[PDB]
């Protein structure tokens, strides 16, 4: 009985290939679940989590904050064209909005 090394560690991922395998089964998405399909998915979940948190860590830094807040997630997600297209029907709790004033509303000379 050999020493166990997690499917995540073998794949090289921080995200859990085990849970992604279970949840692909418990959700009854299909009758059979391949061995590598939880790995591919666990990698994409990890990748997109890095995209969000990279841009949000920049935005937190811009606000002189050490710590990410749903505000910084909203700012990151709306500023980036592709995250904004990926999340174009998602409401983020306590995100607020982008600062955006139509040019016609600004004061006259």
């Amino acid at each position: 009985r050999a020493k166990a090394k997690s499917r995540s560690s073998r794949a090289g991922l921080q995200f859990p290939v085990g849970r992604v395998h279970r949840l692909l089964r418990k959700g009854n998405y299909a009758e059979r679940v391949g061995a590598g399909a939880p790995v591919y998915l666990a990698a994409v979940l990890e990748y997109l989590t890095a995209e969000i948190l990279e841009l949000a860590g920049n935005a937190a830094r811009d606000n002189k904050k050490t710590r990410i807040i749903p505000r910084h997630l909203q700012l990151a997600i709306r500023n980036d064209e592709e995250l904004n297209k990926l999340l174009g029907r998602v409401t983020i709790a306590q995100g607020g909005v982008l600062p955006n004033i139509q040019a016609v509303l600004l004061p006259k000379k």
Partner: protein, 80 residues
Amino acid sequence: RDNIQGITKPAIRRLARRGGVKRISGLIYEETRGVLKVFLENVIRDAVTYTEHAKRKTVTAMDVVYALKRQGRTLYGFGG
């Protein structure tokens, strides 16, 4: 009861400021109340439908999130 009038004029003003609106016709306030309750009457009947079908006599945050997600307005932060 009419707590729809508890959605005050200053509150409808504040929401329009966040929406970036400079000048607001006084007729807007009753239009906005009519629009708000039509939204709530769709989300709560679904949130009730979940608690009813899931056989509980209290409404949980996730009942709302399923209701919203099925309405098409995915909310992140309250489960989901």
